Design a protein around this motif. Structure first.
Motif, PDB file in Angstrom:
ATOM      1  N   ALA A   3       0.931  -1.341  -0.356  1.00 31.71           N
ATOM      2  CA  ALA A   3      -0.175  -0.270   0.396  1.00 31.71           C
ATOM      3  C   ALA A   3       1.142   1.355  -0.213  1.00 31.71           C
ATOM      4  O   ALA A   3       2.193   1.225   0.570  1.00 31.71           O
ATOM      5  N   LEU A   4      -0.202   2.382  -0.703  1.00 29.76           N
ATOM      6  CA  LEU A   4       1.033   3.651  -0.582  1.00 29.76           C
ATOM      7  C   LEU A   4      -0.207   4.666  -0.850  1.00 29.76           C
ATOM      8  O   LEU A   4      -0.636   5.359  -1.477  1.00 29.76           O
ATOM      9  N   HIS A   5       0.342   5.973   0.799  1.00 26.65           N
ATOM     10  CA  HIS A   5      -0.904   6.610   0.728  1.00 26.65           C
ATOM     11  C   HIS A   5       0.012   7.190   1.972  1.00 26.65           C
ATOM     12  O   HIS A   5       0.547   7.257   2.924  1.00 26.65           O
ATOM     13  N   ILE A   6       0.767   7.818   1.641  1.00 24.17           N
ATOM     14  CA  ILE A   6       1.194   8.997   2.348  1.00 24.17           C
ATOM     15  C   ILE A   6       0.604  10.588   1.859  1.00 24.17           C
ATOM     16  O   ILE A   6       0.946  11.128   1.111  1.00 24.17           O
ATOM     17  N   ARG A   7       0.406  11.182   2.856  1.00 17.05           N
ATOM     18  CA  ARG A   7       0.036  12.862   3.333  1.00 17.05           C
ATOM     19  C   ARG A   7       1.107  13.363   4.479  1.00 17.05           C
ATOM     20  O   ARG A   7       1.352  12.833   5.310  1.00 17.05           O
ATOM     21  N   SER A  32      11.948  17.611  -9.078  1.00 20.58           N
ATOM     22  CA  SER A  32      13.307  17.089  -9.567  1.00 20.58           C
ATOM     23  C   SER A  32      13.947  15.925  -9.930  1.00 20.58           C
ATOM     24  O   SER A  32      13.721  15.438  -8.818  1.00 20.58           O
ATOM     25  N   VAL A  33      13.567  15.520 -11.086  1.00 20.93           N
ATOM     26  CA  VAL A  33      14.463  14.139 -11.235  1.00 20.93           C
ATOM     27  C   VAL A  33      15.872  13.976 -11.923  1.00 20.93           C
ATOM     28  O   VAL A  33      15.534  14.562 -12.504  1.00 20.93           O
ATOM     29  N   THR A  34      16.368  13.803 -11.518  1.00 19.71           N
ATOM     30  CA  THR A  34      18.068  13.294 -12.197  1.00 19.71           C
ATOM     31  C   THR A  34      18.384  12.427 -12.413  1.00 19.71           C
ATOM     32  O   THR A  34      18.795  10.942 -11.018  1.00 19.71           O
TER      33      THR A  34
ATOM     34  N   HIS B   5      12.745   9.833   3.261  1.00 23.19           N
ATOM     35  CA  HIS B   5      13.794  10.394   3.061  1.00 23.19           C
ATOM     36  C   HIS B   5      14.085   8.709   2.425  1.00 23.19           C
ATOM     37  O   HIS B   5      14.485   8.098   3.731  1.00 23.19           O
ATOM     38  N   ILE B   6      13.739   8.666   1.032  1.00 22.04           N
ATOM     39  CA  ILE B   6      14.844   7.006   1.368  1.00 22.04           C
ATOM     40  C   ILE B   6      16.143   7.064   0.537  1.00 22.04           C
ATOM     41  O   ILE B   6      16.167   7.473  -0.697  1.00 22.04           O
ATOM     42  N   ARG B   7      16.622   6.511   0.894  1.00 24.50           N
ATOM     43  CA  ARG B   7      18.309   6.522   0.832  1.00 24.50           C
ATOM     44  C   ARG B   7      18.444   4.960   0.522  1.00 24.50           C
ATOM     45  O   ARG B   7      19.177   4.497   1.143  1.00 24.50           O
ATOM     46  N   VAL B  13      18.427   8.637  -4.331  1.00 18.38           N
ATOM     47  CA  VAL B  13      17.833   8.719  -2.773  1.00 18.38           C
ATOM     48  C   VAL B  13      15.923   9.387  -3.297  1.00 18.38           C
ATOM     49  O   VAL B  13      16.455  10.368  -4.649  1.00 18.38           O
ATOM     50  N   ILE B  14      15.035   9.365  -2.515  1.00 18.96           N
ATOM     51  CA  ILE B  14      13.862   9.496  -3.511  1.00 18.96           C
ATOM     52  C   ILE B  14      13.405  10.449  -2.051  1.00 18.96           C
ATOM     53  O   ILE B  14      13.103  10.082  -0.772  1.00 18.96           O
ATOM     54  N   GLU B  15      13.281  11.959  -1.910  1.00 20.76           N
ATOM     55  CA  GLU B  15      12.433  11.946  -0.536  1.00 20.76           C
ATOM     56  C   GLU B  15      11.961  13.643  -1.038  1.00 20.76           C
ATOM     57  O   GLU B  15      11.240  14.103  -1.868  1.00 20.76           O
TER      58      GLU B  15
ATOM     59  N   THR C  27      11.097   1.679 -10.732  1.00 22.07           N
ATOM     60  CA  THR C  27      10.282   1.524 -12.245  1.00 22.07           C
ATOM     61  C   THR C  27       8.775   1.438 -11.771  1.00 22.07           C
ATOM     62  O   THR C  27       8.591   1.407 -10.208  1.00 22.07           O
ATOM     63  N   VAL C  28       8.643   1.908 -12.098  1.00 21.73           N
ATOM     64  CA  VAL C  28       6.303   2.155 -12.283  1.00 21.73           C
ATOM     65  C   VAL C  28       5.678   1.643 -13.003  1.00 21.73           C
ATOM     66  O   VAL C  28       5.951   2.015 -14.679  1.00 21.73           O
ATOM     67  N   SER C  29       5.107   0.379 -12.624  1.00 22.32           N
ATOM     68  CA  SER C  29       4.608  -0.550 -13.970  1.00 22.32           C
ATOM     69  C   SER C  29       2.693  -0.579 -13.805  1.00 22.32           C
ATOM     70  O   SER C  29       2.398  -0.869 -12.079  1.00 22.32           O
ATOM     71  N   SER C  41       7.484  23.952 -10.879  1.00 22.94           N
ATOM     72  CA  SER C  41       7.685  23.913 -11.807  1.00 22.94           C
ATOM     73  C   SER C  41       8.046  22.013 -11.518  1.00 22.94           C
ATOM     74  O   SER C  41       7.786  21.608 -10.324  1.00 22.94           O
ATOM     75  N   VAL C  42       8.022  21.307 -12.373  1.00 23.60           N
ATOM     76  CA  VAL C  42       8.792  20.310 -12.564  1.00 23.60           C
ATOM     77  C   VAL C  42       9.731  20.205 -13.807  1.00 23.60           C
ATOM     78  O   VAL C  42       9.672  20.230 -14.725  1.00 23.60           O
ATOM     79  N   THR C  43      10.886  19.787 -12.948  1.00 21.46           N
ATOM     80  CA  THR C  43      11.491  19.652 -13.636  1.00 21.46           C
ATOM     81  C   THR C  43      12.643  18.056 -14.045  1.00 21.46           C
ATOM     82  O   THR C  43      12.984  17.279 -12.989  1.00 21.46           O
TER      83      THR C  43
HETATM   84  C1  LIG Z   1       7.403  16.876 -21.687  1.00 25.69           C
HETATM   85  C2  LIG Z   1       7.110  15.624 -21.149  1.00 25.69           C
HETATM   86  C3  LIG Z   1       8.505  14.360 -20.847  1.00 25.69           C
HETATM   87  C4  LIG Z   1       9.490  14.910 -19.464  1.00 25.69           C
HETATM   88  C5  LIG Z   1       7.871  15.013 -18.025  1.00 25.69           C
HETATM   89  C6  LIG Z   1       7.614  13.774 -18.169  1.00 25.69           C
HETATM   90  C7  LIG Z   1       8.536  12.688 -17.819  1.00 25.69           C
HETATM   91  C8  LIG Z   1       7.240  10.877 -17.340  1.00 25.69           C
HETATM   92  C9  LIG Z   1       8.186   9.979 -16.437  1.00 25.69           C
HETATM   93  C10 LIG Z   1       9.058  10.281 -15.345  1.00 25.69           C
HETATM   94  C11 LIG Z   1       9.535   9.184 -14.940  1.00 25.69           C
HETATM   95  C12 LIG Z   1       9.820   9.945 -13.207  1.00 25.69           C
HETATM   96  C13 LIG Z   1       8.583   9.270 -12.345  1.00 25.69           C
HETATM   97  C14 LIG Z   1       9.030   7.512 -11.851  1.00 25.69           C
HETATM   98  C15 LIG Z   1       7.581   7.348 -10.594  1.00 25.69           C
HETATM   99  C16 LIG Z   1       8.066   7.875  -9.819  1.00 25.69           C
HETATM  100  C17 LIG Z   1       7.216   7.647  -8.415  1.00 25.69           C
HETATM  101  C18 LIG Z   1       6.890   6.017  -8.205  1.00 25.69           C
HETATM  102  C19 LIG Z   1       8.213   6.202  -6.524  1.00 25.69           C
HETATM  103  C20 LIG Z   1       7.022   6.424  -5.791  1.00 25.69           C
HETATM  104  O1  LIG Z   1       5.634   6.528  -5.751  1.00 25.69           O
HETATM  105  O2  LIG Z   1       7.785   6.172  -4.445  1.00 25.69           O
HETATM  106  C21 LIG Z   1       7.324   6.605  -2.969  1.00 25.69           C
HETATM  107  C22 LIG Z   1       7.349   7.743  -2.287  1.00 25.69           C
HETATM  108  O3  LIG Z   1       7.133   8.280  -4.086  1.00 25.69           O
HETATM  109  C23 LIG Z   1       7.914   8.954  -4.690  1.00 25.69           C
HETATM  110  O4  LIG Z   1       9.079   8.367  -5.259  1.00 25.69           O
HETATM  111  C24 LIG Z   1       7.126  10.232  -6.227  1.00 25.69           C
HETATM  112  C25 LIG Z   1       8.918  10.645  -6.597  1.00 25.69           C
HETATM  113  C26 LIG Z   1       7.914  10.778  -7.886  1.00 25.69           C
HETATM  114  C27 LIG Z   1       8.875  11.097  -8.762  1.00 25.69           C
HETATM  115  C28 LIG Z   1       8.301  11.931 -10.722  1.00 25.69           C
HETATM  116  C29 LIG Z   1       8.356  13.280  -9.881  1.00 25.69           C
HETATM  117  C30 LIG Z   1       7.929  14.684 -11.275  1.00 25.69           C
HETATM  118  C31 LIG Z   1       8.713  14.434 -12.515  1.00 25.69           C
HETATM  119  C32 LIG Z   1       8.654  14.448 -14.500  1.00 25.69           C
HETATM  120  C33 LIG Z   1       7.788  13.257 -14.064  1.00 25.69           C
HETATM  121  C34 LIG Z   1       6.651  12.915 -13.579  1.00 25.69           C
HETATM  122  C35 LIG Z   1       5.650  12.257 -14.662  1.00 25.69           C
HETATM  123  C36 LIG Z   1       4.122  11.692 -13.905  1.00 25.69           C
HETATM  124  C37 LIG Z   1       4.557  10.352 -12.978  1.00 25.69           C
HETATM  125  C38 LIG Z   1       7.066   5.639  -1.663  1.00 25.69           C
HETATM  126  O5  LIG Z   1       6.332   5.795  -0.297  1.00 25.69           O
HETATM  127  P1  LIG Z   1       7.361   5.137   0.771  1.00 25.69           P
HETATM  128  O6  LIG Z   1       8.471   4.400   0.094  1.00 25.69           O
HETATM  129  O7  LIG Z   1       6.952   5.703   1.573  1.00 25.69           O
HETATM  130  O8  LIG Z   1       6.154   3.371   0.418  1.00 25.69           O
HETATM  131  C39 LIG Z   1       6.135   2.767   1.439  1.00 25.69           C
HETATM  132  C40 LIG Z   1       4.697   3.162   1.969  1.00 25.69           C
HETATM  133  N1  LIG Z   1       4.395   4.203   2.549  1.00 25.69           N
END
Ligand SMILES: CCCCCCCCCCCCCCCCCCCC(=O)O[C@H](COC(=O)CCCCCCCCCCCCCC)COP(=O)(O)OCCN
Lengths: 98, 98, 101
Positions: A3-7, A32-34, B5-7, B13-15, C27-29, C41-43
């Motif tokens: 499950a994943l719901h973070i607020r 920001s994604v690098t 903050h996942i390291r 890192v995801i944070e 990966t998200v699938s 902004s998103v970068t």
């Molecule tokens: C002009 C168009 C082309 C360029 C722009 C669009 C590009 C599209 C492709 C983007 C691909 C990058 C994103 C990859 C997936 C990220 C999300 C999955 C990870 C995730 O949900 O992890 C949770 C934390 O949130 C996270 O990790 C959230 C991370 C989100 C990263 C993305 C941020 C936005 C960047 C722009 C792209 C986004 C496109 C739409 C997806 C874990 O949570 P936990 O471990 O606590 O869970 C345990 C229980 N609680």
């Protein structure tokens, strides 16, 4: 996990909803994604709703098929191949209609 | 939860920082999202800094208003409607400067 | 060390959200929709961006800026424009208001 719901205290949400298979990130200011290799999205429909601007800062943007735009500005020249049909106005070069 | 903050052991890192409302993903090689319906981003500014290329591999890219580019390459023709103003150089077709 | 955390979530609809440190792959699938909403902004900073969209990519914005080259298969300009510099057309006919030029 399963499950994943973070607020967060600022009102932001990161959630995955399996009932509708919907991933949501909302209420943030910036993301920001690098990455050192590639970022890929594979999905039928992509929608980017950007009230200011989308900037593609890259040597090359490639649209593999059709590109449709309201208006176009080409700053430093280019090439066109194939049939180019202009209608509905005046095509001019250096102030001279053709 | 309410914090993030996942390291990871490879240095990634995801944070999320709620005081600045900033989501950061860093230190990765690749990211991918595969979806069967849609991917949407709604934010005033979208910035893509891609040192090699941005490919939009799709039947149709739609820019709803203005499109600005440095140079343009059209491979298989097209249509232009409205007034088209060329300036600051030579517009040629099949070898002849119009 | 660099860190010991992990991310591997498998949901009852078959979706997976995971990070694979072996290949440094996020990966998200298996999802239907994703949305990101931000007020600023998103970068994305990465050498290669690939958007593989079997229906459409819409950039619904006042302005799309490509900082260098833009390559397309076909082009449709709906409401006019400006072209500056040298523009070379080859391999077909350039016609305006019915006249082949
Ligand atoms: C002009 C168009 C082309 C360029 C722009 C669009 C590009 C599209 C492709 C983007 C691909 C990058 C994103 C990859 C997936 C990220 C999300 C999955 C990870 C995730 O949900 O992890 C949770 C934390 O949130 C996270 O990790 C959230 C991370 C989100 C990263 C993305 C941020 C936005 C960047 C722009 C792209 C986004 C496109 C739409 C997806 C874990 O949570 P936990 O471990 O606590 O869970 C345990 C229980 N609680």
């Amino acid at each position: 996990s399963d499950a994943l719901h973070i607020r967060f205290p600022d009102g932001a949400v990161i959630e995955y909803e399996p009932e509708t298979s919907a991933l949501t990130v909302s209420g943030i200011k910036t993301a920001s994604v690098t990455a050192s290799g590639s970022v890929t999205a594979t999905v039928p429909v992509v929608m980017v709703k950007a009230s200011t601007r989308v900037t593609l800062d890259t040597p090359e943007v490639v649209c593999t098929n059709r590109l449709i735009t309201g208006t176009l500005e080409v700053q430093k020249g280019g090439t066109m191949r194939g049939n180019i049909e202009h209608t509905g106005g005046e095509l001019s070069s250096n102030g001279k209609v053709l």
